[PDB]
Amino acid sequence: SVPSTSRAMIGIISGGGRIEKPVLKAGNSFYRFRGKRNCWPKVRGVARNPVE
Amino acid sequence: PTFVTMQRKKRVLQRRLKVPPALNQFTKVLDRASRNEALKLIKKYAPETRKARRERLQKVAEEKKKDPKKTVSTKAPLAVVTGLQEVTRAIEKKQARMVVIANNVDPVELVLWMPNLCRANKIPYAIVKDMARLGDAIGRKTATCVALTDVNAEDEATL
């Protein structure tokens, strides 16, 4: 529930269906996150040492 | 500017909150017609300036040097009692016929007790609209309170 004076734009946001395509490559994930932030590749904690 | 906002917001919550009687009594001031007459009587008996006081004492010195045997009075002309310490003593010793108190003294604790002290001593008092108007009457920038101890014969009906 929001106040009725808050504004909204009519329609759906563009670029829909992006998640539908498989990436197929570790190189395509490299370019996707290049504009986002430093979060990839992802090491699994079971693959680390108990100190970390 | 922050000081402009804070002085206006100050005035807002002095009306929004519940003010006890000890502070509300200063918002209920004497009416304008009587305030003007009181200030005219205070101005008539204003204290003498530095120039006037020193000329009077210079003359008194000459009348002393004319004859060292006789003592010449150095008493100042009749005026109002001015100052927090001196006005308080006029109330406690019950020498004040009337006391005029200013309503915008800050800190208010300087004069917050004057109405109750005058009331306990059965001394007429009035709370007036400005401490600068009281200061103008006596010749200074501001005045917290003024007491009338006596007046001349021609001003007894006005008092």
Binding site: - | L84, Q85, E109
Partner: protein, 203 residues
């Protein structure tokens, strides 16, 4: 005198009229700076007791200090060594907030000599103290016998050395005799006397 009415008025601090006056002031003090210079003291009766005179060269500042206890500045609350020294939040500073307010004023303005200070207000998160300071270079100060002493150099930054009244309080100098034997003239002066090893020449 008029002092007697301002003095007894400020002893009734919990009264309705004084709670109203302090509530408007504490709200106002919040929206000001940490150090604020004032033309006149908020409590002239208290300031005059502690050394303030309405003369040239006497200044009043209101200083704000945050309330609460001292949190030990250790990374992530991680302390090493004996568990006796493991506390982070429960420890308390050995200096009162009045001395902290005086020292924060004195370090900021080094051209002034801190004389005293007094309590004016406290709120849930803040505490306000008004610090009396003197200008050593003022001719009025330099010719007045009653404040002449502060122009001397032993009185430079006396608040940083615990020499003000608030500093004397947390040093234990309020007490004398058997309440103060180990802390007189100072805790280190008493320690040196009890712990130095004396070698008389012939023994």
């Amino acid at each position: 005198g008029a002092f007697m009415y301002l003095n007894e008025l400020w002893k009734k601090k919990s009264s309705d009229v004084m709670r109203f006056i302090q509530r408007i002031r504490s709200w106002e003090f919040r929206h000001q700076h940490t150090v604020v210079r004032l033309r006149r003291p908020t409590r002239p009766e208290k300031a005059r007791m502690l050394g303030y005179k309405t003369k040239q060269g006497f200044c009043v500042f209101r200083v704000r200090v945050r309330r609460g206890g001292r949190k030990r500045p250790v990374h992530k609350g991680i302390t090493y060594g004996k568990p006796k020294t493991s506390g982070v939040l429960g420890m308390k500073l050995n200096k009162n907030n009045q001395a902290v307010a005086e020292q924060r004023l004195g370090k900021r303005f080094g051209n002034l000599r801190v004389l005293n200070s007094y309590w004016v207000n406290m709120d849930s998160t803040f505490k306000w103290y008004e610090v009396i300071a003197v200008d050593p270079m003022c001719k009025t100060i330099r010719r007045d016998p009653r404040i002449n002493w502060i122009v001397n150099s032993v009185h430079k930054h006396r608040e940083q050395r615990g020499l003000t009244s608030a500093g004397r309080k947390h040093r234990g100098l309020r007490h004398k005799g058997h309440k103060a034997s180990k802390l007189r003239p100072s805790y280190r002066a008493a320690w040196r006397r009890n712990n130095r090893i004396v070698f008389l020449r012939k023994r």
